[PDB]
C-alpha cells in the first residue's frame, strides 16, 4: 500500500477481511460499517502510516471530511456507524484516491 | 493518470464530466451508464493508453471481465448499458485498482 493510501481504502481493506470483525465490520445493511473498537482501528492506521501517536480523535476528522463531502454518510442516532455512498459523483472521488 | 489506470477508472472520469454525454453518460438510474458511442469511448481509451489499434471489441472484453467478477453488471435486454455494483466486496476491488 502506497504512502498516500487513503484512510477510506485502509478501512475497506480491514472491512473486507471478516477476521477483523472484532474491531471493524460491515453491518449487513448495504454499505454500512461499524467501528467496534475505534481506538484499535486508529492504532492499526497509525501502524500503516508510521504515525505512532495516531488515535481515534485524529482518524475521525477524516471520517468527517469524507461525510461532509458526501463520500460517506454518518448514520444518525448511532455511535461509530458510517456508510459509503452509492452514487455517480462519489464514485469519481473513490476512483481517483490520488 | 498512471500507466496502470484501470478501464473502470477511465470510464468514471469520462462519466463524471457531463460534457461527454454525447458518447458516454450516467443514465440516471442508480449507477447505470450507457456507451452512446462505443467506438468513440474505445478511441479515447486508446489515446489514454497509447494503443492506437484500440476498438470496442477489445474494450468490451474488459467490461465482461468486470461483470463476470461482479464489479459491474451488464443490463439485460439492453445494448451498451452497464452498472457499477454497490456492494461491500465490489468496493474492495475498486479500492485497490492496483
Residue numbers in the entry:
A (entry chain A), B (entry chain A): 337 to 434
Question: How did the manuscript describe this experimental structure?
Answer:
Crystals were obtained from constructs that contained the Ets domain, Etv1 (encompassing amino acids 326–429), Etv4 (encompassing amino acids 338–470), and Fev (encompassing amino acids 42–141). Etv1, Etv4, and Fev display the typical fold of the Ets domain, which contains three α-helices (α1–3) flanking a four-stranded β-sheet, with an additional C-terminal helix (α4). A comparison of the structures of Etv1, Etv4, and Fev in the presence and absence of DNA allows us to identify conformational changes that may occur upon DNA binding. In Etv4, in addition to three residues Arg-397, Arg-400, and Tyr-401 adopting different rotamers, the C-terminal end of the recognition helix switches from a 310 hydrogen bonding pattern (which is the form adopted in all the other ETS structures) to a more canonical α-helical hydrogen bonding pattern, although in this case the difference may be due to the fact an ethylene glycol molecule is bound in the vicinity. Analysis of the contacts between adjacent molecules in the Etv1, Etv4, and Etv5 crystals reveals a conserved potential dimer interface that is distant from the DNA binding surface and is present in all the DNA-free and DNA-bound crystal forms. This interface is centered around contributions from the N- and C-terminal helices, α1 and α4, with additional contacts involving residues from the β1-β2 loop. Dimerization of Etv1, -4, and -5 is mediated by the homologous cysteine residues (Cys-416, Cys-422, and Cys-449, respectively). Similarly, dimeric Etv4 and Etv5 also bind DNA with affinities that are 2 orders of magnitude lower than the reduced monomeric forms (note that the Kd values of the dimeric forms are rough estimates, as saturation could not be reached).
The Ets transcription factor family consists of 28 genes in humans containing the evolutionarily conserved 85 amino acid Ets DNA-binding domain, originally identified as a viral oncogene (E26 transformation-specific). The Ets domain is a variant helix-turn-helix (winged helix) structure, comprising three α-helices and a four-stranded antiparallel β-sheet. Here, we present the crystal structures of the Ets domains of the entire PEA3 subfamily (Etv1, Etv4, and Etv5) together with the structure of the Erg family member (Fev). Furthermore, a new Ets dimerization interface linked by a redox-sensitive disulfide bond is identified, and this dimerization is shown to result in a significant inhibition of DNA binding, potentially linking Ets transcription factors with cellular redox regulatory mechanisms.
